[PDB]
Design a protein around this ligand. Structure first.
Ligand SMILES: [Ca+2]
Length: 558
């Protein structure tokens, strides 16, 4: 305890741009979310987090916000948004929206004023600094390419942007900025939204006097930008003045925070946020310097991080658990085996893992079908401003050969999870009557929601089954987690425990039969579910014969 709705909820993340287009322009919209709420209710989802839905020039597909109180033109109108809320309410579903207050679009009113001159009332809503020797104020690099400082000719000063040039960072040291942002949150909260997901929540506080980063720091600079001295003062003040006045669940995207600093954002006793979005597991295999490059990882590596993330939240914090999202490759491709012989078994294995963590699971759109990475071939096949940034920094500088770069970003690109959702087997997978904004995977003929929703053997129906299982067995939400062997590279096996109620999850990550004898005096009381099982499990069994990619949940004898 204490149980809460958000600790036991299963969330589903909708990327509105890519979910369902209802007017043939090739871009998903709010009406397309509305028309598929029944599909999500059938899956068993009780809360939806949507990516940014606000007025935006779309340099970063919604995360460059030009007006926080207007609906993005491509997604519809305020009336569409209000209908989404009402139709969700009719179905007892809760909405989480994406709060993007580290930065605005450079087209936002505040910035247009800010940049007009030093005497403008909005000058100090952003960070403006003089050059150093006709170079940037310091050596800060941007996540999205080049310098974090952009020269403005009007003023002769540079403005700070951790993300795109078009995403100038807001000055949280200015109390008037925080007050405006709080009034903006009340505008949304007053409409009955149930959740807020805080985008890059850890970078709001900037480092006094902006010193250069050391050579070493430049190889891992995300962590330097989360070291701002006032980050927890600001998050707690936002809690005291806004968040604690409403009845909501809040998540924090803590990019660049070392795991051992994460707890301060989520410890309930700190009155900061509720739910941790950590990067440790999802990017375990990502180079910290060349953040587009991946490397081999093993199951022991993966499970050791699961354990550490679980231990860190400990008694007083709480985790989100997810294996993909709009910023990462698809789970079945990245963590599973997406080849035809294994895709469905691995997707179901990963679903099992996700829906048996001591955490609020987040299912990203299309993962419930076992959607895969997309076979990108050339740089032009990508849309993402971030990959273009990496291309300019690493390839156009001649530092990395184009083909080696592609081999990596094919595996790591955020655009892997942005290809349109595969509704059915018709033209463009039923996503759009027009031309989709980003090409649809040709595997849509094999992988689509219409082919799955009524097949009781489908990935979709296995997610549905797991969600009902998790709802039925409190130990699968609140139970303590023990990894039976953190150094095993083949069979992932852990227990979830509440008093005498003890459940065992076993997943065979190998594409060969694996025999696995339980440790100590553990033995099986019941099979709760299995996928790809061939050898029956009887009362008191002490061993399981695991087919390749087999997964299962078992009640253990007390
Ligand atoms: Ca549309």
């Amino acid at each position: 305890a204490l149980p809460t709705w958000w600790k036991q909820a299963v969330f589903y993340q909708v990327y509105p741009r890519s979910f369902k287009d209802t007017n043939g322009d090739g871009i998903g919209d709010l009406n397309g979310i509305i028309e598929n709420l029944d599909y999500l209710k059938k899956l068993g989802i009780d809360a939806i987090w949507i990516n940014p839905h606000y007025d935006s020039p779309n340099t970063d597909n919604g995360y460059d916000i030009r007006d926080y109180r207007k609906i993005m033109k491509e997604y519809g109108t305020m009336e569409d948004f209000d209908r989404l809320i009402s139709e969700m309410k009719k179905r007892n579903m809760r909405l989480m929206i994406d709060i993007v207050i580290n930065h605005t679009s450079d087209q936002h009113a505040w910035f247009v004023q800010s940049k007009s001159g030093k005497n403008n009332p909005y000058r100090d809503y952003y960070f403006w600094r003089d050059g150093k020797d006709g170079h940037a104020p310091n050596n800060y690099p941007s996540f999205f390419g080049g310098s974090a400082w952009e020269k403005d000719d009007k003023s002769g000063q540079y403005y700070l942007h951790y993300f795109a040039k078009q995403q100038p960072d807001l000055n949280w040291d200015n109390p008037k900025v925080r007050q405006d942002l709080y009034d903006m949150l009340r505008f949304w909260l007053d409409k009955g939204v149930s959740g807020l997901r805080f985008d890059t929540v850890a970078t709001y506080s900037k480092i006094p006097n902006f010193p250069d980063l050391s050579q070493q720091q430049l190889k891992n600079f995300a962590e330097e930008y989360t070291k701002g001295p006032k980050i927890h003062d600001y998050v707690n003040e936002m809690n005291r003045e806004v968040l604690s006045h409403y009845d909501i669940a809040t998540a924090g995207e803590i990019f660049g925070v070392p795991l051992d600093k994460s707890i301060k954002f989520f410890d309930r006793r700190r009155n900061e946020l509720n739910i941790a979005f950590t990067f440790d597991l999802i990017r375990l295999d990502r180079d910290a310097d060349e953040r587009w490059r991946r490397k081999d990882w093993t199951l022991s590596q993966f499970r050791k991080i699961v354990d550490k993330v679980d231990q860190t939240a400990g008694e007083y914090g709480w985790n989100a658990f997810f294996l993909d999202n709009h910023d990462n490759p698809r789970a079945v491709s990245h963590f599973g085996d997406d080849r035809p012989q294994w895709r469905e078994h691995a997707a179901k294995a990963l679903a099992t893992l996700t829906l048996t963590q001591r955490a609020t699971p987040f299912i990203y759109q299309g993962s419930e079908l076992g959607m895969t990475n997309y076979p990108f071939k050339k740089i032009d096949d990508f849309d993402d401003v971030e990959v273009k940034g990496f291309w300019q920094d690493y390839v156009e500088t001649g530092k990395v050969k184009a083909e080696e770069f592609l081999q990596n970003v094919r595996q790591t690109s955020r655009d892997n999870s942005r290809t349109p959702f595969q509704w059915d087997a018709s033209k463009n997978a039923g996503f759009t009557s027009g031309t989709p904004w980003l090409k649809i995977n040709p595997n849509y003929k094999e992988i689509n929601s219409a082919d799955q929703i009524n097949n009781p053997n489908s990935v979709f129906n296995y997610y549905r089954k797991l969600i009902n299982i998790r709802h039925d067995i409190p130990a699968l939400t609140y139970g303590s987690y023990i990894d039976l062997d953190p150094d095993n590279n083949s069979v992932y096996a852990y227990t979830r425990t509440l008093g005498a109620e003890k459940y065992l999850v076993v997943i065979n990550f190998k594409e060969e039969v694996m025999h696995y004898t339980l440790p100590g005096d553990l033995s099986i009381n019941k099979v709760i579910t299995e996928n790809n099982s061939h050898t029956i499990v009887n009362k008191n069994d002490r061993q399981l014969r695991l087919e390749p990619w087999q997964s299962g949940i078992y009640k253990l004898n007390p």
